[PDB]
Amino acid sequence: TIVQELDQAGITDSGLRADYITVSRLFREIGRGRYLGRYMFPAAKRPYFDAFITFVAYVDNLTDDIKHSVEVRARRLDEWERTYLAVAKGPLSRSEQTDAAVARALVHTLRTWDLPYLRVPEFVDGNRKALTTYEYANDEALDEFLETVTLLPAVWINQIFEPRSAEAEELCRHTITAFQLLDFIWDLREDLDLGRLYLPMEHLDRFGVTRADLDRQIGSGHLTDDVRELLRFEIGRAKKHLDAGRGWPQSLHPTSRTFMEADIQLHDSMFPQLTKNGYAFFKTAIARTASAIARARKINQQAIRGGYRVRAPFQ
Ligand SMILES: CC1=C(C[C@@H](C)O)c2[nH]c3ccccc3c2C(=O)C1=O
Numbered sequence: 601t602i603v604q605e606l607d608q609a610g611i612t613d614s615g616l617r618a619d620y621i622t623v624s625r626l627f628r629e630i631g632r633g634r635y636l637g638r639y640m641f642p643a644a645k646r647p648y649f650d651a652f653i654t655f656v657a658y659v660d661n662l663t664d665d666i667k668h669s670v671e672v673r674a675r676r677l678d679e680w681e682r683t684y685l686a687v688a689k690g691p692l693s694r695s696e697q698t699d700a701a702v703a704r705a706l707v708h709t710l711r712t713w714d715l716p717y718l719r720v721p722e723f724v725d726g727n728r729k730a731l732t733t734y735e736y737a738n739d740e741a742l743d744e745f746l747e748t749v750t751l752l753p754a755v756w757i758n759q760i761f762e763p764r765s766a767e768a769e770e771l772c773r774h775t776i777t778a779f780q781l782l783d784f785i786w787d788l789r790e791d792l793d794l795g796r797l798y799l800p801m802e803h804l805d806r807f808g809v810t811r812a813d814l815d816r817q818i819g820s821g822h823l824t825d826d827v828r829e830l831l832r833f834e835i836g837r838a839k840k841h842l843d844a845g846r847g848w849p850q851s852l853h854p855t856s857r858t859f860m861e862a863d864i865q866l867h868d869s870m871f872p873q874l875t876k877n878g879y880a881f882f883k884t885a886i887a888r889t890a891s892a893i894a895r896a897r898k899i900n901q902q903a904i905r906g907g908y909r910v911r912a913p914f915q
């Protein structure tokens with residue numbers, strides 16, 4: 601339980617403990633599948649994993665609340681950022697209550713791990729900019745999204761994973777880039793329906809494809825050779841990044857390897873789903889997790905018997 605994990609982490613402040621408890625329950629609500637990854641980490645690290653993942657998912661969710669206007673979503677980002685900065689520098693609606701718990705846990709997590717907690721607004725600004733960006737002219741323009749929304753939190757959580765070599769950050773950047781590019785491809789139909797194109801226009805031009813072509817053909821039952829070749833190209837670009845980043849687990853502390861090995865393997869499993877049966881994925885509309893938890897429990901206890909201990913909390 602989070603209470604025993606907080607005990608093992610040495611987090612004793614009753615106000616802070618309550619915030620980590622709130623965040624852990626929120627984490628479970630934002631997705632049980634992702635929440636279970638916490639059990640691949642040493643018990644005393646799970647409060648930090650909870651707080652960091654919840655922060656990224658919580659803020660990204662503010663940005664992708666497609667029920668509401670871009671103006672409303674922008675206001676929510678401003679609200680969370682104001683609350684974060686108030687906490688960082690030392691009746692409530694439900695969103696105000698969660699904003700504050702997420703912020704308080706995150707500040708403590710970031711300071712515990714020697715991360716630049718005052719730069720969190722750069723991540724929020726990337727999300728604010730993404731709200732009003734519906735197209736990307738080329739790779740350089742898409743990098744404005746990737747280097748703020750995607751990879752800034754990625755290089756931060758890399759430190760929480762306890763890198764053993766300097767190559768870890770580049771492997772982290774390749775791997776999470778591949779994950780993000782696969783998300784764009786997987787979600788192409790939904791994103792197109794929202795008026796957003798995350799495939800750079802230069803790539804479309806290269807294969808003679810228009811945005812209208814994609815809008816009309818994805819989910820239509822058929823694909824022209826040009827559209828299929830564009831999809832093949834984008835899938836191959838994601839594959840190349842994943843292959844370049846695949847050594848990331850070995851560059852991390854042993855207690856972090858099982859989680860990222862499982863996550864890489866999950867994304868590996870997306871490639872045949874996208875392409876099989878002649879790209880049928882684009883024409884029409886638990887076991888791995890249990891095994892990884894089993895493997896992680898062996899590795900983590902080994903590491904403990906070898907003297908491993910999670911660092912002391914910021915206080
Ligand atoms: C640590 C991590 C991360 C890093 C994140 C916690 O900042 C991640 N970012 C993503 C963007 C799109 C699709 C997947 C990811 C992921 C992960 O799967 C992951 O494990």
Ligand SMILES: CC(C)=CCC[C@H](C)CCOP(=O)(O)OP(=O)(O)O
Pocket residue numbers: 634653656657660664783787
């Ligand atoms: C999954 C993780 C460790 C952190 C969350 C980063 C981001 C939220 C994942 C994208 O996956 P996803 O749930 O599909 O978001 P999306 O709907 O596409 O904007």
Ligand SMILES: [Mg+2]
Pocket residue numbers: 783784787
């Ligand atoms: Mg998506």
Ligand SMILES: [Mg+2]
Pocket residue numbers: 783787
């Ligand atoms: Mg998605």
